[PDB]
Amino acid sequence: NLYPVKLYVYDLSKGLARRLSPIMLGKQLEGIWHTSIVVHKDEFFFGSGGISSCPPGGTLLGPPDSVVDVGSTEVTEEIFLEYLSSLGESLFRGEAYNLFEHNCNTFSNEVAQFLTGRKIPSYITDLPSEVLSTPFGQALRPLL
Ligand SMILES: [Hg+2]
Ligand SMILES: [Hg+2]
C-alpha cells in the first residue's frame, strides 16, 4: 500500500518579502516560508507547543500557497503516529523550537526524509540563514 505525501507551503509574509526584502535585507527573497506535511489525511507541523495536527488547510493560516508533491510512502497511519510520538519526546519537544535553527521546516524536512527518503528544497530550509547573514537579521536576532 502506497500513500501520497505532500508539503503544504505558506508564505508567512503574504507576498511582503518579495516586495520589501531588497530594502529591508539588501537581498531578494520570494517568501518567508512555513511548511507542514500532509499525509494520511491530516496536516502535521511543529511549533513551540510541540507537534500538532489539523485537517489539511485547517490551521489558523488557512489554505496553503502551494501544495508540493514529496512522494509516496509505505508508512501506515498507526506507524507514523508512533514515529511522531518518538520525535516529540526527543528532538521535537516544544522547548526545542527555534525560529532560525529548529523550526517547522526542520520538522517537515526530517519527516519527508523518513517517509520518502527525499529532502525538501533548500530554498525553504536555507531561509533562516539568509536572513541572519544581514544587518537586519543580526540586529533583530536577540528579540527572536
Ligand atoms: Hg487547527
Ligand atoms: Hg517555520
From Swiss-Prot:
Catalytic reaction annotation: S-hexadecanoyl-L-cysteinyl-[protein] + H2O = L-cysteinyl-[protein] + hexadecanoate + H(+)
Coiled coil regions in record: none
One GO BP annotation of this record: protein export from nucleus
Major location (coarse): cytoplasm
Subcellular location: Cytoplasm; Nucleus
Residue span of motif Nuclear export signal 2: 135-144
Gene Ontology cellular component terms for the protein in this record: cytosol; nucleus; protein-containing complex
Motif Nuclear export signal 1 per record, residues: 79-87
Stored InterPro entries: PPPDE_dom, PPPDE_sf
Superkingdom, natural source: Eukaryota
GO molecular function: deSUMOylase activity; identical protein binding; importin-alpha family protein binding; long-chain fatty acyl-CoA hydrolase activity; palmitoyl-(protein) hydrolase activity
Domain PPPDE: 3-144
Similarity section: Belongs to the DeSI family.
Protein name, per record: Desumoylating isopeptidase 1
Taxonomic source organism: Homo sapiens
